[PDB]
């Protein structure tokens, strides 16, 4: 059985693929990678996601069926589709290496632009300088500069409950440089407390399918390893993030 699937690309356009009905996510990602002409090395820098909200998209696990997701969320209105192609990458140096790949630059650029609009990348203090490079479509110079801002290549999650926060929520923020928990209120308004967890402090980590929680165990300073639970509905995505970070740290090819 063949079915069509619509998927959004970082530039706001959509692409349609004719794909087997029970395809898994990687299979659909490979069909999409081919129709837009990603090369053998670009294909490893992007992955399939599901739009959850205006401010959050979630990575599809390997064992999902994108067509099921697509129909579940389909209507005749919509800006288009709930499936989207987004960068999957934590170390910005492997990005710099692709600066002479027009496809990847274009995708990196349009996503970075939209993550600026959304507040993910904190470019405020050079906003005008960045604006000027955007207007002239000097894409690589915009990116080489935006890549120095706070929040570049950081995955921010919706606020939720944490078993080591008696009242209030956390917003978890994940990057190659560390694991941050931001204290926010009940409704998600930021307090002003925050905790940076070094990745080498991360001892082990799990999910809890039934409690719907991600779990991580850290040894910091000198105390004895302690468990923290985050009651996020996206525990699998957050688990994929830990695995991906440790993977990228093992293969970090630069001292800076």
């Amino acid at each position: 059985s063949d079915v069509e699937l619509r998927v959004a690309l970082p530039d706001g356009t959509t692409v349609t693929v004719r794909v087997k009905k029970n395809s898994t996510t990687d299979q659909v990602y490979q069909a999409i990678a081919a129709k837009v002409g990603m090369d053998s090395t670009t294909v490893n820098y992007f992955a399939l996601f599901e739009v959850i909200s205006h401010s959050f998209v979630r990575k599809l696990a390997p064992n999902e069926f994108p067509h099921k997701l697509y129909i579940q969320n389909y209507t005749s209105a919509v800006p288009g589709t709930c499936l989207t192609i987004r960068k999957w990458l934590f170390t910005t140096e492997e990005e710099i290496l692709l600066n002479d790949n027009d496809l990847a630059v274009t995708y990196f650029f349009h996503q970075a632009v939209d993550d600026v609009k959304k507040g993910y990348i904190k470019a405020e203090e050079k906003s005008y300088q960045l604006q000027k490079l955007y207007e002239q479509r000097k894409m690589v110079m915009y990116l080489n500069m935006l890549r120095t801002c706070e929040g570049y290549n950081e995955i921010i999650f919706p606020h939720c409950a944490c078993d080591s926060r008696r009242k209030g929520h956390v917003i978890t923020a994940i990057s190659i440089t560390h694991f941050k928990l931001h204290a926010c209120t009940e409704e998600g308004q930021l307090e002003n407390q925050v905790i940076a967890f070094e990745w080498d402090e991360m001892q082990r980590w799990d999910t809890d399918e039934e409690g719907m929680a991600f779990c991580f165990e850290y040894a910091r300073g000198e105390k004895k390893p302690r468990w923290v639970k985050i009651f996020t509905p996206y525990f699998n995505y957050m688990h994929e993030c830990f695995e991906r970070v440790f993977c990228e740290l093992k293969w970090r090819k630069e001292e800076y």
Binding site: S164, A183, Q193, V228
Partner: peptide
Amino acid sequence: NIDIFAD
């Protein structure tokens, strides 16, 4: 549980 934001 002990609160990690205890300061």
